Amino acid sequence: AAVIELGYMGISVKDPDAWKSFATDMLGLQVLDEGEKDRFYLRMDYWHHRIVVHHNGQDDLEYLGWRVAGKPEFEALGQKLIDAGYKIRICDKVEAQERMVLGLMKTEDPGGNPTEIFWGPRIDMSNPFHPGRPLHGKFVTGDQGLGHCIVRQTDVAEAHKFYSLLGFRGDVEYRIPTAELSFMHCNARDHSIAFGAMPAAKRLNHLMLEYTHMEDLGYTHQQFVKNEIDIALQLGIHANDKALTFYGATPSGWLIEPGWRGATAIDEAEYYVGDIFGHGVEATGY
Amino acid sequence: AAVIELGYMGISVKDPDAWKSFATDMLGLQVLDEGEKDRFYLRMDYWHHRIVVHHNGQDDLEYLGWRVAGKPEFEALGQKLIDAGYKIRICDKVEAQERMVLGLMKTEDPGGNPTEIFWGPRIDMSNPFHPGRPLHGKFVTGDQGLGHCIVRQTDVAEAHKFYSLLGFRGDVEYRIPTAELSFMHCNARDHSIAFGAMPAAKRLNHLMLEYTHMEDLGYTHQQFVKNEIDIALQLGIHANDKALTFYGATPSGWLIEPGWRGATAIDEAEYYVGDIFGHGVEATGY
Amino acid sequence: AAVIELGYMGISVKDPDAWKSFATDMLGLQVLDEGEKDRFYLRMDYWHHRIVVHHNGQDDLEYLGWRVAGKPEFEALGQKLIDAGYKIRICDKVEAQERMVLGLMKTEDPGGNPTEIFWGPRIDMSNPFHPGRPLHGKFVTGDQGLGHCIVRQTDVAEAHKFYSLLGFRGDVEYRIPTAELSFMHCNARDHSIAFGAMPAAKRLNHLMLEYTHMEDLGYTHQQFVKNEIDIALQLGIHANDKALTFYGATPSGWLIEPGWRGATAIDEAEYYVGDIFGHGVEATGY
Amino acid sequence: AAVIELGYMGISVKDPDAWKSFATDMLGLQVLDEGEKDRFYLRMDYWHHRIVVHHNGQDDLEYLGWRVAGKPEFEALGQKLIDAGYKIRICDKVEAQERMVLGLMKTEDPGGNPTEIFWGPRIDMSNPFHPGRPLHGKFVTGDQGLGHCIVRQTDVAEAHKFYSLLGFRGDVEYRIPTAELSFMHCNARDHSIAFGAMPAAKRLNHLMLEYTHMEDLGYTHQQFVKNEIDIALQLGIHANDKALTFYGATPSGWLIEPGWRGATAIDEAEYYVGDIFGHGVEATGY
Amino acid sequence: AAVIELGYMGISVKDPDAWKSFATDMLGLQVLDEGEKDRFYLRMDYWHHRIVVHHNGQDDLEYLGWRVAGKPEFEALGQKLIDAGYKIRICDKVEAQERMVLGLMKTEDPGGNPTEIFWGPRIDMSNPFHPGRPLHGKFVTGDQGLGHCIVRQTDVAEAHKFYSLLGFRGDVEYRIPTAELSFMHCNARDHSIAFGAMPAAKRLNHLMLEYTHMEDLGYTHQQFVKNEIDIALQLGIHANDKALTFYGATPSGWLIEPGWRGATAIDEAEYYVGDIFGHGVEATGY
Amino acid sequence: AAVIELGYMGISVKDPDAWKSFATDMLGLQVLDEGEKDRFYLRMDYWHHRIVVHHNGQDDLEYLGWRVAGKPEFEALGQKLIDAGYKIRICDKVEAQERMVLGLMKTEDPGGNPTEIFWGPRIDMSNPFHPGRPLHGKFVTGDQGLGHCIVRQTDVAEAHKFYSLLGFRGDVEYRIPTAELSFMHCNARDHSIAFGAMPAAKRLNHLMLEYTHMEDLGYTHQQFVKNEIDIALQLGIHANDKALTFYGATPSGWLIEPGWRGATAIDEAEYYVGDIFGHGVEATGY
Numbered sequence A, B, C, D, E, F: 001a002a003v004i005e006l007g008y009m010g011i012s013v014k015d016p017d018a019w020k021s022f023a024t025d026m027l028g029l030q031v032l033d034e035g036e037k038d039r040f041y042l043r044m045d046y047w048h049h050r051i052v053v054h055h056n057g058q059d060d061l062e063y064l065g066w067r068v069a070g071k072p073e074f075e076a077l078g079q080k081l082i083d084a085g086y087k088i089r090i091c092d093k094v095e096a097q098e099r100m101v102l103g104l105m106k107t108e109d110p111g112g113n114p115t116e117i118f119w120g121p122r123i124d125m126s127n128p129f130h131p132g133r134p135l136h137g138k139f140v141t142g143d144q145g146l147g148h149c150i151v152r153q154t155d156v157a158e159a160h161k162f163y164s165l166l167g168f169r170g171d172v173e174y175r176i177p178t179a180e181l182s183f184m185h186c187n188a189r190d191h192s193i194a195f196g197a198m199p200a201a202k203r204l205n206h207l208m209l210e211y212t213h214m215e216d217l218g219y220t221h222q223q224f225v226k227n228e229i230d231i232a233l234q235l236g237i238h239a240n241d242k243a244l245t246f247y248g249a250t251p252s253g254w255l256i257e258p259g260w261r262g263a264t265a266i267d268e269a270e271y272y273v274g275d276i277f278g279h280g281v282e283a284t285g286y
C-alpha cells in the first residue's frame, strides 16, 4: 500500500476573479474563500477542498498532492524514497496545517514537478458540496481522487521509475504516428497521472474532471461555446479510459478536460494507435 | 490476525438494583442473574453475556475483553506483546472459567485500563436474546462486537502503539478548536476504542450501544426524557461513523451513548473539525 | 376485493390461568391483560391483539374475524351477502369498539360458526411484540393474517358457497382412503380456512400458528414433550402448504398446530391422497 | 381464465413392453404400473402421471387432457363451448376417477382429436419423480404443462376457432415454400398445440418433451443413434421457440421430439420461412 | 493450501446385502457394483464413489480419504508430515489405482485411524447420480466433501496437532456437564472431523450425510421408524452447525446422522454447553 | 503473476485464399489484410488480430503468443526461465513491432513448439470486430484469451514443468482405455494448452474457438456439413470444460474445434475416463 489517489492540487494564477467566474459558471466547482489574502479554494465534494488557487502566480501548477492511507504507509513510502536515493523533506506541523493534512512530505518528480505525499485530509462533513452553478449531478471523486493530470517530463523512464515507487501502475498506452504516451493509475480511475517526452512551456498540460451526469458535461460544453472559450480538442472517447471528454482553455492557458463515464483501471497493459472517435483539433496552439 | 472485536466488558457499580432497572427499562438490555452473590450479567444477543456487572463497586470500568479468532492468534499476540516489552499474564483454567472463555490473558493498557485478551466465548444458542423491555428490533453486534468505549489515556502515542500491536487501525480523526481525538477500529464497526489526552476522573468516558432500529433509539431517548435522566449531549450525527446518537447519564455517572446507523470502518485516515449536526451540550458536568 | 385475512379470533376457556401459562411458555405468544374482568388478549405482532380469550367459557371457538381492506369493500360485501340471502347484522359503535375495529358486521357460516367481517384493526405501533418466552424469531402474520383454522361443517357445498362469496378460493385438496377435505385461501397463506363433512363435538378442530424460525418450532415441540402434553399428530409436512408442523393439545381440548415454512397459496386446484412424510397419529381421541 | 396447460395425454400402443423400455432407457421417463390389466403410466414430475399408455391399441393418440385452474373456470368454459354450438359431455364421478381428476368433460376438436378438459389433477407429493434412467437434470413441466403436440386437422380455421375459445393464442408462424403452420400457446411454453392442413394417417404427428439439461438431451440423442432408432429430423433450433431439438421414431411410428431451452411464448404474432439451423431430414417417411 | 475435503471413506461390513438395502432404501444412496468379489461402492453425486464398502469385515471404519487440490499440495503436505516426524508412505500406481485417484499416501492419525491423503479423484460425469430410492432432492457434497465423521482419539491434543498440520481449523466447541468435544473444518462444511477423549469400541462413532431437501430428511426419519431401526438421538439442531439432524443405527452398529441445513464453517472459535433443541436420547447403548 | 492468456498465434498455410474463405464463411472470423505480401490477419474482437496467417507455409503452427500483464511480470518470468536453465531471447524493437506488442521474448517449449511471451498487445478500439459472415453473437475472448490448443509433446513431464513455470495449473484429466491427457489453464478458460505423449506429424492437433451463442455454433456445424468438410469428431460435451463442441478439418489438415458454453477452470484436479456424451469418430485419419 502506497499512493491511493490524487487528493489535492495547487495552482497559481494571475487573475483570481476570472478563475472564480470560470470555475463556478463554466465548470460548476464551488468557490470557498476563507479570507486569506493570497489564495482561495475550489471544492468538488465533502473535502475542505480539492484545488488550492494561489494569487500573484505563474498560471501553472504549483503542486500535486498524493494521498496514502495512513501514517504507516506514509512512513514506509518515505523510507522507500530515501533508500532509492530520492530527496524528500518531512514537513513540520505548520506546513502540514497549511495544506490541512495530518502528515506531509515534499519532493519533486524527475520532471521537476513539485510533488507532495500526505495522509489525513480534512473532510468537512458538516458542509456538503454546493456547486457554483446548478448541476444535474455531482463530480466523480471518492476512491478515484479528484481527477487526472498530464505533466511535463524530460526522461519518461525516470518518471516511470518514480511513480512506480509511489505505487502506480501503467506504461505506454498510445503509439501515435512515433510519439509514445504513458498513463499510470493508483486506484480505479483509469489514470491519475500521464506523460510523454514532448516539450512543454508549462508543468501542466491538462487537468481532467469527471461529472457523474452526461447532462452536466453537455451543459459545460455549451457554456464554453456560448462564452467563446477555445475548445482545443472536440468531444471524443478515449481508447484507454472510454470516457466522453473535450478539452477547453482555462484562464491560465493550460487545458481543462471535462468528461463523463470513465472506465475502471486495468493492470493488463494494452496499447492503441488512436481514439475511438472525435477529439479532433479545433483551436490551435495548446 | 489479532483482536477482532470488543467481546465483553466488566463494570462495577454501587447500586445493582438501579442498574437492573436502568438496563432493562431505559436501554432494553437483558438481565441474567445466575445467583452469584457479587455480580450479574447483561445480554445483547446469543452470547451468554456482553457485560458483567460487579456489585460493591467503584461505578467505573473493571475490564475490557478483546476477542481473537482462536488459540493460534491468542498465542501469537501473547508472544508479540512479550517481545515488545509489555507485561502480560496467561490465566489458568479457573480464571478463564470465571470469564466463560476458553483462553484468557490479562494486562493493562498504557493508560492503566485493565485489558483482557481471550478466545472462545460462551454462546448460548439455546437461549435467544430476550430484551428487558419490548423492542422493535435488536442490537447490532456480530462481527462488530458489543459497541465502543472511550477510555482515559495519559500518553496518546503510547496508547496508539499498544492498540496498534493488538491489530487496531486508526489515528486522530477530530481536531477541535486544539484537542485531538483518536479513534481505532478492529472490525467493521467504525470504532471500538477511542481516546484523547484530556483528564478524566474515571477510566470510562462512555459506552456506545447500537440498535438495529431507529424506533428503539427514539423510544430510548423518550425514556431518558420521561424519567428526567440527564442528557449530556443531544441527538446528532458523528462525522466519522455517521451514526445518529445521543449521550445520557448512567447510574454510575459515566455516559451511555445509544445510537443507530453506524457506518463501516475505513482504513483511509480522514479528519474533521466538527460533527454533521447536533450533539449540543445540554446537561453539564460530564 | 373482499376478505383479505383472518385478522382475529375469539375463544372461550374454562381455565384462563392455564391458558396464560400455555400461551406464553408453550407457544411464545404474548399475554396482554387490560384489566377486564372477563377476558384477556394474546398478541403475535404489532396488532393490539390477534386472539381474544374470554373467561367463564365453553373451551371452544367464539368467533372468527375476517378483515376487508376498507369501508368500500365492507359495504360491498355486506350488500353481496344480503343479496344472496344470508342474514347479517351491521354492528353499532359500541360493538365495533369492543372488537377494536372501525367497522363490524356479524353473521354465522352455514356450519353455525360465528363469523365477523370488519375493517380497520387497531395496531399498536408504539408497543412492539414481546413474546411470552424468549424466541429466536417471531410469527408469520402480515398479509397472511394470524394463521388458519379448521372448523366444523354440516354441508360442505354450502360452506364453499359462503366462503366463495367472501372472496376465498379453493376446493377439495385431499381424498383420504373416502374422506374429502377442502381448503380455502384469501391471501398468500396456503389456506386460512378448511373443512370436511366429518362430525365434531367442537366448532374448532385446530388452529395453526406459524413461526419464522425452525428453531422456535423445534423448541415448542420440545416444550410439549417435556411437559407431557399430548401430541395428536407427530411432525410432518403437508402436501398442500409444504409446512413442517405437528399437532398438540391445548387446555381447551382442541388442537394447536405449530408450524414453519408454509408455501404460497395457488389458484390452480390440485389434490393429494396423503402427506409428504410424518403426521402419524400418536395421542388418540382428537 | 380458461385452459392453462396440457396436463396429461393418453396413447394406445401395440407393444407395451417395447414402450416401457423405450420410455425409460431412451427418454428417462418413469414407468408406473398400478397393476391394471390394460394400461400403465409414465411420470415426469410429482403428478401421479403425465401420460397414460393403454394396451391393445392403435399406436396413436387416444386423448389430450387440458387443465383449467378450478371449478369456476371449468363451468365457465363448458357453458362457453355449449353456447358456441360445440358438443360436450360432463363426465360422472367414475369417469373423472379413471383420469384421476376432480372434474372432467369430454369432446372432440374439429379435426376429430378426442379432447378432455379437467380441473384438479392428482399430485403425488409423497412420491418424487424417479427417472427410468440416470438423469443429469429433470423435465420442464410446471406452469408449462407436459410438452406440446402437433395433431391432424382438416380445417385450420375451425381448429383455430376451437382452440381460441379454449383460451389459446397464436396463428400461422411458418410459411414454407406454400405450407402454413399454426402454433398456439396457453401458458409460457412457446406452443402447446400446433397444426397445419396436411394429410396424416395418424392423429398425432409428434410429442415434444423438454429436458432441463442439455446433457440429458445429448445423451438421449446418443441413445437413439446407439440403438439405431430412426432420426427423422436432425438436431436444430426452431425460429419460434428457440429450442434445441431433434425428432426420433417411437415404437408407435409417430415421432418424439426431445428438446432443451424453449423460449417464453409471445402474444405478438411473428412468422418465419425457415428454422435457425439444422432440422435436416435424415430418416424418410415420417 | 492443504486438505480441502473428506473425499471418500472405506468401511468394512459383515452383511453386504443388508448394507445394500439399508443404503438404498433407508438413505437413498446409490449402489454401484463393479463385480469385484470383495467390495462394492456407494455414490452420492458424480464421483465414481464416495464410500467403499468392503466385505468380510469388522463392521467399522477402514480409512478416511482426505483430498488436496493437486500434486503441488500433495507433495508439500507429504514433506510437512515427514518434517514434523509423522510416518507416511507414498503409494505406488497399483495402490493409487485401487482407490481410483491420481496420487495417494497412507498414514494413521494419532488415534490409530487409517488416514489417506490424495489428489485427483475419478469423476464419472457421463454417469449422473441415481439415488437408491426416489428423492425430492440430492446430497450436499461439492466443496463440502461427502459429510463428517466423529472418530476415536486417545490424546486430543495430539489429534489436534495432526489435523492442524493437514490444514484443518477448530477447537473445543462443547463443554458438556465436564466433557470437551472438538470440531474441525477444512472447507465450508461446519465440521468434517470431530473427536473427544471418550472411550470407544469402534474407530467410528458416526457419519453425517446431508440432504439438500428437508423432505428427504423427513422421509428418511420415517423409514427408520417404519422399519423399527434404533434412533439413538432424536431430531434436533446443533448449536455449532445449525443443522437439523437425528442419529440412527446402521447394520454395522455405528451411527448414521442424516441431516439438513448445515451452516458455513467459521474460523472464530465459539463454545456451547448444549444444543438448540432436541437430540434427546431414545435408543440406549450407542 | 505470470502468463494470463493465449493472446495470439501464428500459423503458416499453403493456400491463403482457401483459408480466407474458410475463416469467414465457415467460422465467422474477420479477415484483415494490411497489404503485406506474406501474411494476413484474423480478428475475433477489438485486438488488432488474434491469428497471423503466414503464406508460403507448412500448414502447421508457427508460434503461440502468451500474454503477461505488464513489463514487471515479463521481466520476472524471463529471469525465472533463465534461472531454471531454459534458453530465451529478448527481442529487439523491430521484432516486437512485427508482432505488434510492446515487449517480446522467444523460446521453444520442451516439445519444440515455438513459444512467445509478450506484454502490451495492440488493441484497435476504433475498429470494432466485424465478422466474416453474419453472426447471432460474437466470440468468447476477454480474460480467457483466444481459445485453446493441443500441441505435440515428447516428454509430458518436461512439458508440465515448463508450463508450470509459466504460471499454468493442471495435470492429467483423462485416462482413456491407457492414454493420459493433460490439460492446463492460465485464466478462467477451462484449459488454454493441453497435450499427451502420442505421436503427431504436426505441432498442432487442434485449435478450439468459442462462440457466445449456440445458434452460431449450430450454423457453423451446418456450414461444415453443407460444404462436405470432414467432421472428425461429432458434437459432444467434454467432461472437463463442459462445452458443446465438434471437430472439423481445416484447409491445413489440422482440426478446428468450434464450441459453446465452456465452464470456468478449477484448481482442484479431477480426472475422467470419458466424455459426457457424443464426440464419436466420424471422418477418420485426424
Ligand SMILES: Oc1ccc(-c2ccccc2)cc1O
Residues within 6 Å of the ligand: A167, A168, A169, A185, A186, A187, A188, A189, A264, A265, A266, A267
Ligand atoms: O499499483 C496499482 C494501484 C492501483 C490499482 C487498482 C486499484 C483499484 C482498481 C483498479 C486498479 C492497481 C495497481 O496495480
Ligand SMILES: Oc1ccc(-c2ccccc2)cc1O
Residues within 6 Å of the ligand: A150, A181, A182, A194, A195, A196, A198, A199, A200, A205, A286
Ligand atoms: O502538448 C502535449 C500534448 C499531449 C500530451 C499528452 C497527453 C496524454 C498523455 C501524455 C501526454 C502532452 C503535451 O505536452
Ligand SMILES: Oc1ccc(-c2ccccc2)cc1O
Residues within 6 Å of the ligand: A150, A174, A176, A181, A208, A238, A239, A240, A241, A257, A274, A275
Ligand atoms: O486522458 C487521456 C486519455 C488518452 C489521451 C490520448 C489519446 C489519444 C492520443 C493522445 C492522447 C489523452 C488523455 O488526456
Ligand SMILES: Oc1ccc(-c2ccccc2)cc1O
Residues within 6 Å of the ligand: B167, B168, B169, B185, B186, B187, B188, B189, B264, B265, B266, B267
Ligand atoms: O487493523 C484493522 C482491523 C480491522 C479492519 C477492518 C475489518 C473489516 C472491515 C473494515 C475494517 C481493518 C484494519 O486495518
Ligand SMILES: Oc1ccc(-c2ccccc2)cc1O
Residues within 6 Å of the ligand: B150, B181, B182, B194, B195, B196, B198, B199, B200, B205, B286
Ligand atoms: O471528557 C471527555 C470528553 C470527550 C472525550 C472523547 C470523546 C471521543 C473520543 C475521544 C475522547 C473524552 C473525555 O474524557
Ligand SMILES: Oc1ccc(-c2ccccc2)cc1O
Residues within 6 Å of the ligand: B150, B174, B176, B181, B208, B238, B239, B240, B241, B257, B274, B275
Ligand atoms: O463515537 C464518537 C464519534 C465521534 C465523537 C466526537 C465528535 C466530535 C467531537 C468530539 C467527539 C465522539 C464519539 O463518542
Ligand SMILES: Oc1ccc(-c2ccccc2)cc1O
Residues within 6 Å of the ligand: C167, C168, C169, C185, C186, C187, C188, C189, C264, C265, C266, C267
Ligand atoms: O380469492 C383469492 C384470494 C386470494 C388469492 C391470493 C392472493 C395472494 C397470493 C396468492 C393468492 C387468490 C384468490 O383467488
Ligand SMILES: Oc1ccc(-c2ccccc2)cc1O
Residues within 6 Å of the ligand: C150, C181, C182, C194, C195, C196, C198, C199, C200, C205, C286
Ligand atoms: O376430526 C377431524 C379431523 C380432520 C379434520 C380436517 C383437517 C383438515 C381439513 C379439513 C378437516 C377435521 C376434523 O373434525
Ligand SMILES: Oc1ccc(-c2ccccc2)cc1O
Residues within 6 Å of the ligand: C150, C174, C176, C181, C208, C238, C239, C240, C241, C257, C274, C275
Ligand atoms: O393445514 C393442513 C393441511 C393439510 C392437512 C391434511 C393432510 C393430509 C390428510 C388430512 C389433512 C391438514 C391440515 O391441518
Ligand SMILES: Oc1ccc(-c2ccccc2)cc1O
Residues within 6 Å of the ligand: D167, D168, D169, D185, D186, D187, D188, D189, D264, D265, D266, D267
Ligand atoms: O391466451 C393466452 C394464454 C396464455 C398466455 C401466456 C401466459 C404466460 C406467459 C406467456 C403467455 C397468453 C395468452 O394470450
Ligand SMILES: Oc1ccc(-c2ccccc2)cc1O
Residues within 6 Å of the ligand: D150, D181, D182, D194, D195, D196, D198, D199, D200, D205, D286
Ligand atoms: O407430416 C407433417 C409434418 C409437419 C407437421 C407440422 C409441424 C409443425 C406444426 C404444424 C404441422 C405436421 C405433419 O402432419
Ligand SMILES: Oc1ccc(-c2ccccc2)cc1O
Residues within 6 Å of the ligand: D150, D174, D176, D181, D208, D238, D239, D240, D241, D257, D274, D275
Ligand atoms: O415445435 C416446432 C416448432 C417449429 C416447427 C417447424 C419449423 C420449421 C418448419 C416446420 C416446422 C416444428 C415444430 O415441431
Ligand SMILES: Oc1ccc(-c2ccccc2)cc1O
Residues within 6 Å of the ligand: E167, E168, E169, E185, E186, E187, E188, E189, E264, E265, E266, E267
Ligand atoms: O484451515 C481452514 C480450512 C478451511 C477454511 C474455510 C474454507 C471455506 C469456508 C470456511 C472456512 C478455513 C480454515 O481456517
Ligand SMILES: Oc1ccc(-c2ccccc2)cc1O
Residues within 6 Å of the ligand: E150, E181, E182, E194, E195, E196, E198, E199, E200, E205, E286
Ligand atoms: O460415545 C460418543 C459420544 C459422542 C462423541 C462425540 C460427538 C461429537 C463430537 C465429538 C465426540 C463420541 C463418542 O465416542
Ligand SMILES: Oc1ccc(-c2ccccc2)cc1O
Residues within 6 Å of the ligand: E150, E174, E176, E181, E208, E238, E239, E240, E241, E257, E274, E275
Ligand atoms: O455434528 C455434531 C455437532 C454437534 C454435536 C454435539 C452437540 C452437543 C453435545 C454433544 C455433541 C454432535 C455432532 O455429531
Ligand SMILES: Oc1ccc(-c2ccccc2)cc1O
Residues within 6 Å of the ligand: F167, F168, F169, F185, F186, F187, F188, F189, F264, F265, F266, F267
Ligand atoms: O495458475 C493458475 C492460473 C490461473 C488460474 C485461474 C484464474 C482465474 C479463474 C480460474 C483459474 C488458476 C491458477 O492456479
